[PDB]
RNA sequence: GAUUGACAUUCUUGAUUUUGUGGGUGGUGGUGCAU
């Protein structure tokens, strides 16, 4: 009798709700079909044919003329910074332990920045990086392209003629590797394809030549992928 | 007279549940007599579903004048009757999503709801509800700046302080006008309303959440009067963090 | 010419834009204290 009470009362109020909803939909349908364009009789007989608001619009237009900005996104302590730093360190160290246990089109950068010697090259690379990623509303293919061009560029730069300014070479290649790693932290999935193709093509270099296709940029190629 | 099927429309829209709408009440924009015809429908009765779809069509035909025509006479105060008559103060998801469909047209939404909600009857609980439903969804940015401007030049009410507190944990990119507005907010609270009022932890957290990162257009005399602001209003939770934002901010 | 209302395709709204690049978690909450 308890289950019949629940079932009977719910079916009774459910049928009441269904009858009421069907009646309301029928009223909407009939009132539509008798008042939609049947109100064209009354459409012509009976017809009908800010200082604080201007202050608010003035403030809106003044902010539209001149504004400024807010620093960065948040406010928190260096203790929380050290906590999150140790958290990221512990997570990445345990992840590496678990992994152990189980603009430029490869000659356009040459044609562009084949002017100065060493210091301006990193500056032109940073200028191309500032050109792409700042206004990057669609910049992905040019992005990954000039990552690949920077890798190939240190490849065809690393062993040309190093008996000119050695320390300028050393500082510009060190700075080039720092800026390469620091930009390619966010971009692995376009650079690693080019590294794979470089492996596949230096194997074909070794396939023909006995030893002398092993240009001495391959040493620093192995070194920089061991860096990144 | 009007064509007067509006008895049938009012009878079905008293307890409307689900389905389709009468298309005279869909093309009620393109007939010249919308306010004069709802004045003879007289829907003091309401369904929350037709509140939602009616404010959808009312956004589709609201300007300043139309917003004054419908929303500033009976529907805002119907929302007020809903919050006072809800005994546990449960303003429904119906009413809330009606407000979120209502918040679209920003042309005179200030006089649409924010001008007549500081009329009377706004307590701090209705105020934190209204600031919550404002901070939920999309907002006009320049009108948020203008809103902070006029609501800070408005007289002092703790509903307006929690309003402006939510509008400043919006985490904006602040114009000069609103930064100068906040430094004369400090010039407004002085020995102002330091002897005539006292400001506990809610006002404290309001200006602390201002000073979290709202400091990137601040020179050294502004740092000096913020320094004597906290020196006058010394709480327990000011020292390291507001000294940190004082050493953190720039010009 | 962005989005809004669509008289099934063709006109009554106007920067709330639109798209990316990023990114804050999202509070109509319960539980001592003066009510």
8 Å CB contact between B41 and B9: yes
Four-residue CA torsion sign, A134, A138, A144, A149 = negative
Q: How far is CA B149 from CA B126, B153, B187, in A?
A: 22, 6, 15
Which B positions 99-158 lie with beta carbon below 8 A of chain A?
Answer: 108, 110-111, 115, 142-143, 145-147, 149-150
**Nearest nt to the B140 alpha carbon by C1':** C16
Provide the CA B209 to C1' C35 distance, Å, integer: 30
Helix (H) or strand (E) holding A143: helix A141-155
Q: For residue A104, give the nearest of A79, A128, A121, A120 by alpha carbon.
A: A128
- CA angle, corner A25, sides to A24 and A29, nearest 5? 120
**Nearest nt to the B105 alpha carbon by C1':** C16
Q: Is B234 helix (H, G, I), strand (E, B) or coil?
A: coil
E strand map for chain A: none
Q: For residue A150, give the nearest of A190, A212, A104, A100 by alpha carbon.
A: A104
8 Å CB contact between B152 and B180: no
Collect all residues with Cβ–Cβ distance below 8 Å to B109 and sequence separation of at least 6.
B67, B103, B140, B143
Collect all residues with Cβ–Cβ distance below 8 Å to B48 and sequence separation of at least 6.
B92, B94, B95, B98
A99–B contact, CB cutoff 8 A:
no
- CA angle, corner A162, sides to A156 and A165, nearest 5? 120
Distance CA B97, CA B249 (A): 39
Residue spans of alpha helices (H) in A39-118: 42-45, 51-65, 78-101, 108-112
Breaks in chain A at C–N > 2.5 Å: after which residues?
Answer: 49, 102
Four-residue CA torsion sign, B202, B203, B207, B208 = negative
DSSP A101-115: H---SSSHHHHHS-S
Letter string b/e over residues A29-60, b meaning 16 or more CB atoms within 10 A of that residue's CB: eebbeebbeebeebbeeeeeeeeeeeebbebb
8 Å CB contact between B213 and A75: yes
**Nearest nt to the A137 alpha carbon by C1':** C20
Q: Which among A39, A68, A72 is the nearest to B24, CB-wise?
A: A39
A54–B contact, CB cutoff 8 A:
no
Distance CA B76, CA B79 (A): 5
Q: For residue B52, give the nearest of B83, B86, B75, B81 by alpha carbon.
A: B75
Distance CA A173, CA A122 (A): 9
Question: Is B23–A28 a contact, with Cβ atoms under 8 angstroms apart?
Answer: no
8 Å CB contact between B58 and B71: yes
DSSP structure class, residue B110: I
8 Å CB contact between B246 and B238: no
CA-nearest residue to A70 within chain B is: B173
- Determined by cryo-EM
Burial class (CB in 10 A: 0-12, 13-18, 19+), B150: middle
**Length of chain A (residues):** 228
Four-residue CA torsion sign, B218, B219, B225, B228 = positive
Residue spans of alpha helices (H) in B71-157: 76-85, 93-102, 109, 124-136, 141-153
Statement: the CB of B183 is under 7 Å from strand C = no
The dihedrals phi and psi of B91, each to the nearest 5 degrees, come to: -70, 125
8 Å CB contact between B147 and B167: yes
> What tokens were used for A74?
């948040």
Resolution rounded to one decimal, in angstroms: 12.3
Question: Is A67–B175 a contact, with Cβ atoms under 8 angstroms apart?
Answer: yes
DSSP structure class, residue A41: T
Q: For residue B248, give the nearest of B206, B202, B204, B216 by alpha carbon.
A: B216
Q: Which among B19, B143, B216 is the nearest to A71, CB-wise?
A: B216
Question: Is B3–A60 a contact, with Cβ atoms under 8 angstroms apart?
Answer: no
Long-range pairs for B83-86 at CB < 8 Å and ≥24 separation? B83/B126, B83/B129, B84/B121
DSSP structure class, residue B192: -
**Nearest nt to the B30 alpha carbon by C1':** C12
Q: Which among A36, A47, A74 is the nearest to B33, CB-wise?
A: A47
Q: Which among B22, B64, B175 is the nearest to A28, CB-wise?
A: B22
């Amino acid at each position: 009798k308890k289950t019949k009470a629940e079932v009977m009362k719910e079916v009774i109020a459910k049928s009441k709700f269904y009858k009421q909803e069907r009646q309301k939909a029928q009223g909407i349908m009939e009132d539509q079909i008798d008042n939609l364009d049947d109100n064209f009789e009354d459409v012509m007989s009976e017809l009908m044919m800010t200082d604080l608001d201007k202050e608010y619009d003035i403030k809106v237009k003044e902010l539209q003329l001149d504004k400024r900005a807010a620093p960065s996104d948040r406010t928190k302590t260096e203790e929380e910074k050290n906590a999150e730093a140790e958290e990221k360190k512990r997570e990445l160290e345990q992840q590496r332990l678990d992994r152990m246990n189980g603009r430029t089109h490869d000659a356009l950068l040459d044609q562009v920045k084949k002017l100065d010697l060493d210091d301006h090259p990193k500056i032109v690379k940073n200028i191309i990086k500032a050109y792409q990623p700042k206004l990057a509303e669609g910049n992905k293919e040019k992005l990954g392209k000039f990552t690949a061009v920077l890798l190939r560029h240190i490849i065809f730069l690393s062993n040309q003629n190093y008996l000119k300014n050695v320390q300028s070479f050393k500082r510009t290649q060190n700075a080039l590797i720092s800026i390469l790693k620091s930009l390619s932290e966010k971009y692995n999935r376009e650079l690693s394809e080019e590294c794979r193709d470089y492996i596949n093509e230096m194997q074909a270099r070794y396939k023909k030549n006995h030893f002398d296709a092993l240009s001495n940029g391959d040493l620093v190629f192995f070194s920089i992928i061991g860096i990144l | 007279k009007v064509i007067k099927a509006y008895t049938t429309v009012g009878s079905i829209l008293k307890t409307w549940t689900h389905g389709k709408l009468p298309k005279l009440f869909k093309v009620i924009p393109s007939l010249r007599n919308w306010q004069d015809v709802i004045y003879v429908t007289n829907p003091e009765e309401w369904s929350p579903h037709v509140v939602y779809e009616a404010t959808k069509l009312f956004v589709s035909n609201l300007t300043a004048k139309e917003s004054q025509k419908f929303i500033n006479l009976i529907l805002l105060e119907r929302f007020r009757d809903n919050i006072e008559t809800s005994e546990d103060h449960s303003l429904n998801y119906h009413i809330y999503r009606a407000v979120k469909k209502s918040l679209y047209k920003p042309s005179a939404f200030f006089k649409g709801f924010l001008f007549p909600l500081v009329e009377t009857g706004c307590n701090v609980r209705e105020a934190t509800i209204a600031g919550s439903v404002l901070a939920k969804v999309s907002v006009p940015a320049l009108h948020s700046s203008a809103a902070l401007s006029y609501l800070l030049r408005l007289p002092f009410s703790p509903p307006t302080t929690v309003f402006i507190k939510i509008l400043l944990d919006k985490k904006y990119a602040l114009p000069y006008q609103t930064v100068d507005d906040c430094v004369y907010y400090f010039m407004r609270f002085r020995i102002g309303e330091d002897a005539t009022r006292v400001l506990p932890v809610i006002w404290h957290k309001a200006f602390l959440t201002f000073a979290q990162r709202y400091k990137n257009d601040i020179t050294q005399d502004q740092r000096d009067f913020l320094l004597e602001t906290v020196r006058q209003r010394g709480h327990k939770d000011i020292g390291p963090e507001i000294r940190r934002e004082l050493l953190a901010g720039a010009s």
